[PDB]
Amino acid sequence: MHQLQPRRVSFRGEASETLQSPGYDPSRPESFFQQSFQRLSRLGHGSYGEVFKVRSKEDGRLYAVKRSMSPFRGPKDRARKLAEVGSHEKVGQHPCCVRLEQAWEEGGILYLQTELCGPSLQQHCEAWGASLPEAQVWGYLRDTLLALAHLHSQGLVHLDVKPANIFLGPRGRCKLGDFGLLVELGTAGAGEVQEGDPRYMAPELLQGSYGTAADVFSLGLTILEVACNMELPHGGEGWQQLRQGYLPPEFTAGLSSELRSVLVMMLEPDPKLRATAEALLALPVLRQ
Ligand SMILES: Cc1nc(Nc2ncc(C(=O)Nc3c(C)cccc3Cl)s2)cc(N2CCN(CCO)CC2)n1
Ligand SMILES: [Cl-]
Ligand SMILES: [Cl-]
Numbered sequence: 001m002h003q004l005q006p007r008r009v010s011f012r013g014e015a016s017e018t019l020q021s022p023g024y025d026p027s028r029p030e031s032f033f034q035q036s037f038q039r040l041s042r043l044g045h046g047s048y049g050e051v052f053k054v055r056s057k058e059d060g061r062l063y064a065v066k067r068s069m070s071p072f073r074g075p076k077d078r079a080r081k082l083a084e085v086g087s088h089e090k091v092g093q094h095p096c097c098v099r100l101e102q103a104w105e106e107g108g109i110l111y112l113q114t115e116l117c118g119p120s121l122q123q124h125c126e127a128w129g130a131s132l133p134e135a136q137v138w139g140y141l142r143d144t145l146l147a148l149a150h151l152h153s154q155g156l157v158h159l160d161v162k163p164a165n166i167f168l169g170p171r172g173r174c175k176l177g178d179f180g181l182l183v184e185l186g187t188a189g190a191g192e193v194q195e196g197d198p199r200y201m202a203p204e205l206l207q208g209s210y211g212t213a214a215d216v217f218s219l220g221l222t223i224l225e226v227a228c229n230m231e232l233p234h235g236g237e238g239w240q241q242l243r244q245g246y247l248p249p250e251f252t253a254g255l256s257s258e259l260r261s262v263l264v265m266m267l268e269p270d271p272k273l274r275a276t277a278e279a280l281l282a283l284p285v286l287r288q
Contacts, residue, residue, distance in 0.1 A: 006032040006106035011086035019104060023057040031106050033067065049109075053116060062116040063101060071108025080192065081110050087182040088112070090156060096147040098167060098177035117167035117175055121226060124168055131229040134259060139172040141223050141262070142286050147176035148219065148277040152212040155185040159210070160196030161218035163226060185211070199232045203243035204271045213271035216280075220266030227259065228252055245269050258285045 005026050006019050019026075021036035028035060037054040040062075044051040049069040055062055072078035085103040093099055099115045118124075121140065125132065132140075144166060151158055158176065165178040183193045195205045202217035204210065221242065225232050228251040233239040241248075245267065252260065262285065265275035280286060 003107070006104050009082055009085045009103040009105050009110065011089055021056075021058045031109075032104060033065065033106070033111055037063075037065065054113075056113075064114045064116045066112045066114075068110045072110075078105075078108075083189075083192070084180040085110075085112065087156075087179040087184075090154070090182070090184060091151065091179055094147060094150045096143040096173070096175050097150065098175045114177070117177070118169055119167065120164050121166040121168065121174060121222075122163035125163060125226050125229070131254065132226050134227065134256060136172060137223060137227045137259065138286070138288075140166070140174050140226070141219075142281070143174045144176055144219055144222070145277045145281050145286065148212075148215050149281060151182070152215070152277055155187075155212075156182055157185060157210060157212050158182050158196075158215050159194070159218075160200075161215050162197050162200045162222055164197075166222070199234060199239075202271065203269050206243075209271070211271060212276070213274045216266050216274055216277060217268075217271075220263055223259075223266070224252070224263055227255060227263075242267065243269055262286075 008017060008019060019032055021032070024032055024035040036057050038057070040053040040055060042050055043053050043064060047069065049067050051064055051066045053062065054065050068081060072081065082105070085100070088100045088103075091097050091100075098117060101113045101115065103110070103112045105111070119127075144161070148158070148161070158179065159181040160178060161176070165176065167175050167177055169175060181194055181196050183189065193210070195201055195210070196218065200218040200221045202210075202214040205214060221232060224230060224247075230248075230251040233242070245264070247260070247263065247267070255263070262280065262283070265280065268274040
């Protein structure tokens with residue numbers, strides 16, 4: 001038995017370049033990941049695999065690397081996992097999007113290497129233990145809207161906007177990440193489209209319908225959650241009322257009229273009436 005060398009995963013159609021790094025010798029049994037990075041800590045894990053903080057031997061910089069758990073079960077499993085790279089490449093470089101440095105597969109395992117960001121917005125709020133100060137909220141709302149405008153004007157829908165998928169950066173900035181469910185509208189692959197976390201899901205998705213507006217609604221609930229320190233319902237009347245243009249006055253009494261107004265625009269039940277990211281970013285309140 002002999003082993004295939006690791007190989008880059010990319011959908012850009014560029015000439016197939018074969019992997020190299022200081023510290024890496026392809027005749028050794030250790031994986032490219034093992035040889036090419038100093039593993040520093042584990043940032044996260046799940047049925048998908050694990051995310052590590054690492055230092056690159058290529059450039060001495062810190063990165064995050066996501067490593068799948070177990071080898072591909074078959075060709076379609078492999079295709080579905082590799083498509084995350086293709087989605088992520090469609091996002092390109094944007095200051096409010098988590099940047100993909102490179103991706104590769106080895107031994108049936110997929111690796112995605114991104115810039116290292118701060119903690120997720122979920123983690124931050126959990127630590128904070130209270131509603132975020134509204135000044136913070138506005139800044140996160142703006143940055144995540146900038147990410148969505150960037151996606152949407154290219155016909156891309158993220159479909160899983162939520163605090164766990166937004167990462168902090170210095171000076172109150174943040175970046176949208178996790179493009180594993182992102183779809184390009186009106187091209188091939190409509191068959192492989194799947195809704196995101198049901199806690200944050202837009203109402204139209206209940207009937208199977210989606211579009212860029214679904215992200216605006218999910219981001220609305222994201223901002224509601226962090227601005228009010230509210231536990232979003234998983235279902236029932238509470239879940240349904242949030243999809244019918246209603247806000248619980250209890251958790252939301254503290255909000256400014258301006259932020260309340262903006263959330264109502266974002267949570268509009270009819271996707272055809274719902275505000276676009278572009279229209280929101282043009283509001284004077286998001287152009288300070
Ligand atoms: C969960 C978590 N991630 C952090 N930074 C990240 N950067 C990028 C991440 C990421 O997942 N990239 C990615 C990949 C790799 C593939 C596809 C898609 C994407 Cl988006 S996760 C920081 C953090 N902290 C933990 C606690 N603190 C340490 C001291 O205690 C502070 C920092 N925790
Ligand atoms: Cl490995
Ligand atoms: Cl398969």
